[PDB]
Design a protein around this ligand. Structure first.
Ligand code: HEM
Ligand code: HEM
Ligand SMILES: Cc1cc(N)nc(-c2cc(Cl)cc(CN(C)C)c2)c1
Ligand SMILES: Cc1cc(N)nc(-c2cc(Cl)cc(CN(C)C)c2)c1
Ligand SMILES: C[C@H](O)[C@H](O)[C@H]1CNc2nc(N)[nH]c(=O)c2N1
Ligand SMILES: C[C@H](O)[C@H](O)[C@H]1CNc2nc(N)[nH]c(=O)c2N1
Ligand SMILES: [Cl-]
Ligand SMILES: [Cl-]
Ligand SMILES: [Gd+3]
Ligand SMILES: [Gd+3]
Ligand SMILES: [Zn+2]
Lengths: 401, 401
């Protein structure tokens, strides 16, 4: 039973939930690989067995009539068809637990407040687009963002997968350039090509929203433009540095991840986009200041009068703090939900306390929970954590191309 | 079998073949990752062969005359006496390799420049004291700091051990009050109680240098006042916040770690203090801002007139950067060697490439190589890393009680 200490306070707990980690991960006693980014009817039955047990525990009906019935049921359907079907309530629970179990998500204090949209009757790439537009519209909610997930038909024997090819519903083009560079966001160079290759007329700005590439089973991907008024965006300004609006920077309101696989009781939903709201450091630090992304740090620092000839002046740390201030002010000026790394990490500490009393522990990836600026100023820096994989879960999956 | 390791800023891919060795099994298993945790007769012969085998390959001398010869003398030394002594160059070679193998040390680009003082012919604390004092004054060198280690006698059964009872050689007092709360450094509260228990005059200050408690085998400790002209300290001023000086903060110049156990070739020296120079964030962010340390962050933010009434103003981030600017400025004006986290991380990347060429890898502990402010603004943040245990090594060890 791993003993875990908080160093700010001195307190100590033991992560007994870790001892039930099912699917296994990348470390051995020889070597830790925690820092790596990307590390049969009988088994479907025992996964499904396990999830059903979970679900009946969470409704306070373990060992009951309905419980054993549903086991008998699920086995009969795997025997007859090779798969089975989630009931709707079971689906809502399995998607909430997936969020709860996500080790690298700092936002998990909210895991119980999740709007689940059932798209499992979906039928083409065209219906898919309509369900997606509805999701974006419900979640954006004019800037008062809500947490939502839409679940498209499960992977099943005989038919291909639904897939969203875009890593997120809202992404900006990244055009490789004349002189070997990139206009727009360089993380989206590949999907940008794919879009042009599938009939998109490119733009040439730095913040061009990309069309959606949607894949119906056994179909090529289909291109869909998002209606402009569905994509709420936020012009970035700085409360005191007024030249900052002359950078022309923007970001969008809704973070909607769309390339992850949701696994519930052995079933796999390769298309199930989900969305919450941003933490300011994703936008301010990573998306804008990463050397391999928009890379605005030096330009801000020059403008700020800072001496960028020596690193001991800490120009990078200064410019980056003001970039974050701009991101929070901008989102509050526009009345668009946003959480800063101090509030986010503080409520994550509340999540670890709630979870220790509930399940005796909480899967957490320290290097992803700790923000990329001001780490030891947040309380999660001083919290030891145990990283492991519980099911239901969101998994990464390879790109459909 | 050879971990693939990627750099996300550039896209480069390398393989850690060096990971193949790894003696003292790490704390992680395929079911849970524990990387974030701070503190996770004739066996002597195997450890001794391998260390000697290292030595000779590192001087292009494996499998030649003096190597097989040196293999016999240790065979005979342990056969006769159940232990062995190290040739002076081997002790030199082991101390440098241990440093080279410290996964959490970001300064290992310096690993080949180490001054080893052999203190093995030692007995009594009154003698250790002058060994420690020659180190300190050689290490300090009037602010032009120099890496040194002093190795006190190894260990045998039936006999006590040399131990330094302080974690560092320069530690500041920590006194409680009519209400538990601490004046001085709360990290040292415990060893401050012992010095007072062992008849030391407690001061009335936030920055009283503690006296060493040195211990000779099978004997009680003995207090020692360090020569006040030997303790080089740096008063903290900010180059443009004129009031910062008046806050009366100081830190000492020499980070000198006197509680880890040097393990070379199968022998264990529980007393082997090493020293280098500080990285600025160690002082500015960890020591002066950690909630359980000096915790000055909010008192600096009031003086800068920042808005402490909401965390979205990023006042913590703002005050922390200026504290760090004051540390770098104060040390440079005092002409004392110090390195900022940008300069240090870039050098550590350079170390990683050196070591990939030399030894096909490098054990590195991501969570401690990435600095505690401005993490993703340094290149090590975007470097995947592999953590494992090589020998010779430094190890943590029980407090001497
Ligand atoms: C409501 C506000 C939310 C916030 C503030 C938040 C925050 C974050 C952040 C900062 C990350 C790290 C991502 C990065 O650095 O690129 C992350 C990862 C992640 N989040 Fe959340 N999130 C929220 C909602 C959600 C929702 C609604 C879901 C799913 C239903 C979710 C599932 C995930 C997953 C699957 C990951 C991948 C991490 C892993 O592999 O475990 N999050 N989150
Ligand atoms: C020359 C400049 C050096 C710098 C800037 C430096 C920096 C650091 C830092 C920042 C840490 C993290 C420790 C903490 O956060 O409390 C560390 C750990 C450590 N350093 Fe260095 N260091 C230097 C020299 C040395 C030398 C000379 C030695 C010994 C020969 C050494 C051996 C270690 C060891 C054993 C650790 C413990 C980490 C571990 O392996 O678990 N360092 N160092
Ligand atoms: C729902 C949600 C909220 C949020 N605040 N963030 C995310 C996020 C998740 C993943 Cl799995 C990947 C990314 C992309 N990152 C490189 C910035 C963002 C997701
Ligand atoms: C030689 C050296 C240089 C440096 N720059 N740092 C260290 C250090 C090491 C450890 Cl094992 C612990 C600490 C103390 N920490 C609480 C800050 C400092 C050591
Ligand atoms: C190599 C390194 O592990 C990688 O850059 C990780 C580190 N921690 C992170 N943490 C978060 N939240 N998001 C990230 O993208 C990363 N990247
Ligand atoms: C719990 C967590 O592992 C612990 O607080 C670590 C994190 N990273 C650190 N990094 C350094 N350099 N020093 C530390 O003390 C710590 N503390
Ligand atoms: Cl993003
Ligand atoms: Cl220190
Ligand atoms: Gd102005
Ligand atoms: Gd005034
Ligand atoms: Zn690990």
């Amino acid at each position: 039973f791993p003993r875990v200490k908080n160093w700010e306070v001195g307190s100590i707990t033991y992560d007994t939930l870790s001892a039930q980690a099912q699917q296994d991960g990348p470390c051995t006693p020889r070597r830790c690989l925690g820092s790596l980014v990307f590390p049969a009817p009988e088994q479907l039955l025992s996964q499904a067995r396990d999830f059903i047990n979970q679900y009946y525990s969470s409704i306070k009906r373990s060992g009951s009539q309905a419980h054993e019935q549903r086991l008998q049921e699920v086995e009969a359907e795997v025997a007859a068809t090779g798969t089975y079907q989630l009931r709707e309530s079971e689906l809502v629970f399995g998607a909430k637990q997936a969020w709860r179990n996500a080790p690298r998500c700092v936002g998990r204090i909210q895991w119980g407040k999740l709007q689940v949209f059932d798209a499992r009757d979906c039928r083409s790439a065209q219906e898919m687009f309509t369900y997606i537009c509805n999701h974006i519209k419900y979640a954006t909610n004019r800037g008062n963002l809500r947490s939502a997930i839409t679940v498209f038909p499960q992977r099943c024997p005989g038919r291909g997968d639904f897939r969203i090819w875009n890593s997120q519903l809202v992404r900006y083009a990244g055009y490789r350039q004349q002189d070997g560079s990139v206009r727009g966001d360089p993380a989206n160079v590949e999907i940008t090509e794919l879009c042009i290759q599938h009939g998109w007329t490119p733009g040439n700005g730095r913040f061009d929203v990309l069309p959606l590439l949607l894949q119906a089973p056994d179909e090529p991907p289909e291109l869909f433009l998002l209606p402009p008024e569905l994509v709420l965006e936020v012009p970035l300004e700085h409360p005191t540095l007024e030249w900052f609006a002359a950078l022309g920077l923007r970001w969008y309101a809704l973070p909607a991840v769309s390339n992850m696989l949701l696994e519930i009781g052995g079933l796999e939903f390769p298309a199930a986009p989900f969305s919450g709201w941003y933490m300011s450091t994703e936008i301010g630090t990573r998306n804008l200041c990463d050397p391999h992304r928009y890379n605005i740090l030096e330009d801000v620092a020059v403008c700020m009068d800072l001496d960028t000839r020596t690193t001991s002046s800490l120009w990078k740390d200064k410019a980056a703090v003001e970039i974050n201030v701009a991101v929070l002010h901008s989102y509050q000026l526009a009345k668009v939900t946003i959480v800063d790394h101090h509030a986010a990490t503080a409520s994550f500490m509340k999540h670890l306390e709630n979870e220790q009393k509930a399940r005796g522990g909480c899967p957490a990836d320290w290097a992803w929970i700790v923000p990329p600026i001001s780490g030891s100023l947040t309380p999660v820096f001083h919290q030891e954590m145990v990283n492991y994989f519980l099911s239901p879960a969101f998994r990464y999956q390879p790109d459909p191309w």
